[PDB]
Amino acid sequence: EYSQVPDIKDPIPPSAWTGPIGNVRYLLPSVQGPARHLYDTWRAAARQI
Amino acid sequence: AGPMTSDPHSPVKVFMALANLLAQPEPIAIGVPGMHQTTPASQFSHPGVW
Amino acid sequence: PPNRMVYPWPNQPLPRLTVAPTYDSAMSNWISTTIAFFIRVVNSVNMTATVNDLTRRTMTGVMTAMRQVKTMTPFYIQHMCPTELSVLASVTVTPPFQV
Amino acid sequence: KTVLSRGYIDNAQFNPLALRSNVLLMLLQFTLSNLKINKSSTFTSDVTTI
Amino acid sequence: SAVAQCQDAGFLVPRPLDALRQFDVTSAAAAEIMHAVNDAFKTAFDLDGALLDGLALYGDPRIADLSAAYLQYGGNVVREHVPPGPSHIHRTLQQVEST
Amino acid sequence: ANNLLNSTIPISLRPTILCPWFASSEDLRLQQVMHLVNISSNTAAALPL
């Protein structure tokens, strides 16, 4: 079961990230698509929290 | 709680909130067409709809 | 007429690429007026059924942002594209067919 | 070669058409590099023949 | 000042170096110049946060100017201007250029 | 402090002091406007304030 890894058909390019913040990288505004949607949704919820 | 907010439209929203409940016994006139006394009060967010 | 070609937009020679030709083009005028028009549309009283104040400002901010951003496309249309069309028509195997 | 030069001209060349801008930027750095204070220091008399 | 001097008679700045050639005046060049200045100041004074950024948001510093206003439903406008105050370095730079 | 915490200074010679800590309103006005330019004008800007 755990020997499986998902296969992404369009990975996020490395150039789509900002500089590091120690461990994490923020997502560049110019990037669109479902990932952008996911990023905004979680970010908005984080703000409310 | 009306006055405590900074929204300019709050007084109208307050006024319409009661007007919704009294649409049956006490009717009044609504200026712009397409809006009725039973319209949700929170929609009155435009200076031209007072 | 022979050795002639018609064009949907007005055309002028290629000037120095300074600020004034960047924003005076007819296409730019078309964009500016159009967005200006839709702005007073979305702010019309009739949109209240769906557009609260927050949305109203949000839509307004989007439109004005679209209007403000620089683009060289209108300049290219008015001062550079006709040159490219003129030369290309002289070498393509099928000459232009116009009304 | 501060601007308008990097991916456009050879290492050995300079851009004659962007001279005014590059000169201006160079002078700017010259200006900023000298924003200091001329603090004093120890003075002494000279006891030599000079 | 720097962006204006590279242009032809931009704004109302003195132009001591005008004898020198500067062919390209496109908005791209202006953006590059503004970034150069912005980096220079950040380096010289060891600044940390965003400084002078966002002016290139629309991507044409050649017409950059600050202003604020608010509008009333009655049609009245305020249109407050925010011009910069007098500066020392700017005046100093002119002497350097003249020299 | 609205004249609370009233305080005063001694009266004696202070030869070589220098406290470059001030600016005109125009500077403040300019900085305030600049600050408003470098934000996303949605709620994300207002909330921290």
Next chain:
Amino acid sequence: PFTRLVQNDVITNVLVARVDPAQRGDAAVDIRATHATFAAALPVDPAAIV
């Protein structure tokens, strides 16, 4: 400014501009077409206020 029940004085927009409209030739245009707009609102609860 805090306006109060004056319909003609309701502030609909707070605006800011990054560029001079006179350069663009926008001198005669609606202000909203030339300046950016702020848009932020906070949904408070009446019960806590009361």
Next chain:
Amino acid sequence: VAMLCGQTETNLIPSHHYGKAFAPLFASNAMFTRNQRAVITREAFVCAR
């Protein structure tokens, strides 16, 4: 989108760029073959008619 995003290059000299780009276009001979084929078309048409 194309109407609104019209970026241009940094060191753009219209004379250089156009001349460089147009020079290959005149290496073709299709312009002449077109004329020849048209001439043959005429003679074929007249005789056929």
Next chain:
Amino acid sequence: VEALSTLLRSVTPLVLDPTVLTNAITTISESTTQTISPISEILRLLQPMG
């Protein structure tokens, strides 16, 4: 039309890049479950078409 369009794209100095436009718009909008229908078309517009 195809051949002519390919030639034009291969010969023009114009460059199409929807970067600055995206940056400007994203300062206003946000892709969240609230305020999605108002901006759905905008997201379609900014979607990378290739």
Next chain:
Amino acid sequence: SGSTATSTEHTANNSTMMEYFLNVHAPSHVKSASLKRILTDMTIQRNYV
């Protein structure tokens, strides 16, 4: 994902991707005009659990 504590994360991501698919990806990509007509005017809060 050993107990109900994982259902929250997966349900959140599940909803997010579905919403983006309905409102953005599908209309931009589907062909049938009738499908577009019915696919629009549809949202997760009243069409998906």
